[PDB]
Write a protein that binds this ligand. Structure first.
Ligand SMILES: Nc1ncnc2c1ncn2[C@@H]1O[C@H](CSCC[C@H](N)C(=O)O)[C@@H](O)[C@H]1O
Ligand SMILES: Nc1ncnc2c1ncn2[C@@H]1O[C@H](CSCC[C@H](N)C(=O)O)[C@@H](O)[C@H]1O
Ligand SMILES: Nc1nccc2ccccc12
Ligand SMILES: Nc1nccc2ccccc12
Lengths: 257, 268
């Protein structure tokens, strides 16, 4: 809550999206694994629609690279102004923006349609219509008079809920809150840390609720989802680096029903 | 007739060849735009990748003939040969490769071409690994003159004879006429082992191009002239494809009408 007030976006990016965790060359790393889950999922042609919302985007865009070719209206979100500012720096190709081009290139590699990475970034930048504040603790996380088209055909969320929740029930309630944004029959792609209890973002020291795969699954069910897919990536030693205590990463593909 | 004079004009004219200007003219946009799949860059990379993907072109050693200051022509090749020789007539080109080999920032940036080859080869290789492997496999950069019967000189370093040759936009760009072109092909063919493969890329119906102050003379050749010379030199032609240069890529840096790609195997 107040902890997120010290949250340094550049320190978070550095910690998680620069070497070693950001080395995309080795297929056995977490970056490649995440992009694979995303790419494979959309390549099924079963997650489709006009509008999409990314929950708790932070200062990162990688989580939409494969998504952006299946949704013409994309909304990004975060609780922090500084994170929203950092996104704009990349959306507007402004000065000092974070360099996502390695991830773009890899999404292009993985998707295998021979797309160049610049075309990919262009499409993402074009389809992102708005960056909005959000609080998942609020039963109406986007507030009242939201410019975002509701309900969304699909949701994506990476490393948010467990990271903003003191315990299971809060995680459960947060999942309930975002779920109200999703149209019935719609899809949620959810990615997150497994059995993590803290991580660092510069001066900020954030508390995390350690969750298991089974816990994640049960929560989705409780929230009204059929779980179509749930995979775990176990975190190799070399990617365990003092910035946190994550044990694995989960990917869930859930369908509101 | 007499070979010496034409060859002499050629040598003379290349003394003004400016590598950076050439790089800019041909490998920066619009020609360097790899995003449009209908462009010449992606066509060239595709010819090479697809050819190497047959698994049919392999061995220990490969020689690139008239590399100039470019490396794109070896990106797909380099997973198939442990020993690669690069070559050029001009020291300033060889220096240019020097800069890239040393991975200096001053170097021309080939990373879009590296990524694009990774993209179409379809193995999910990252571009940094592709580049690191090319840099490792290039064992030497040698002077070369294709008008000499021994284009590498006598008692050359190169492992001869090579298992394969690559050559891009060299032969036609340094030959005053068809008979000169044919002889240059004969000369480099002495470096290839029998049963070896030659991958040849070049300009079709071009008579000139610019490389700075350098406005250089090229023999215009047709696809059929290229086919006959390969046969004349003892190759079976396995593949010969033509790219027609789109109007928007016809930028006044040359009068090229198209580009040819040939896969030929030396008889024996
Ligand atoms: N109460 C709240 N409601 C919604 N998002 C919140 C929140 N409190 C903090 N956040 C955001 O949750 C994010 C967790 S980390 C950023 C994750 C990013 N999507 C990526 O995958 O790396 C931070 O950006 C943080 O600012
Ligand atoms: N007599 C000769 N024998 C062999 N190469 C020569 C030569 N005279 C000039 N060259 C080289 O022929 C090249 C033509 S430009 C082609 C460069 C590169 N292979 C690419 O694909 O773009 C220049 O590098 C030029 O210096
Ligand atoms: N453990 C963890 N927390 C937040 C973001 C991450 C991104 C990539 C790997 C691990 C992460
Ligand atoms: N080197 C060269 N000469 C004429 C036409 C070209 C077209 C595309 C790449 C290189 C070319």
């Amino acid at each position: 809550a107040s902890a997120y007030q010290r949250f340094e976006p550049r320190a978070y990016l550095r910690n998680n999206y620069a070497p070693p965790r950001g080395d995309l060359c080795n297929p056995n790393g977490v970056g490649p694994w995440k992009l694979r889950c995303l790419a494979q999922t959309f390549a099924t042609g079963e997650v489709s629609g006009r509008t999409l919302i990314d929950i708790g985007s932070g200062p990162t865009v990688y989580q939409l690279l494969s998504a952006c070719s299946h949704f013409e209206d994309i909304t990004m979100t975060d609780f922090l102004e500084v994170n929203r500012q950092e996104l704009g720096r990349w959306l507007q190709e402004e000065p000092g923006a974070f360099n996502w081009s390695m991830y773009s290139q890899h999404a292009c590699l993985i998707e295998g349609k021979g797309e160049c990475w610049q075309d990919k970034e262009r499409q993402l930048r074009a389809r992102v219509k708005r960056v909005l504040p959000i609080d998942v603790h609020q039963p109406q996380p986007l507030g009242a008079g939201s410019p975002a088209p509701l309900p969304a055909d699909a949701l994506v969320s990476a490393f948010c809920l467990e990271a903003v929740s003191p315990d299971l029930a809060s995680f459960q309630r947060a999942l309930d809150h975002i779920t109200t944004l999703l149209r019935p029959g719609g899809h949620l792609l959810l990615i997150g840390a497994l059995e993590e209890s803290w991580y660092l973002a510069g001066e900020a020291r954030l508390t995390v609720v350690p969750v298991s795969e089974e816990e994640v699954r049960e929560a989705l069910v409780r929230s009204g989802y059929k779980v179509r897919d749930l995979r775990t990536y176990i975190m190799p030693a070399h990617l365990q680096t003092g910035v946190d205590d994550v044990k694995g990463v989960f990917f869930a593909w859930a369908q509101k029903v």
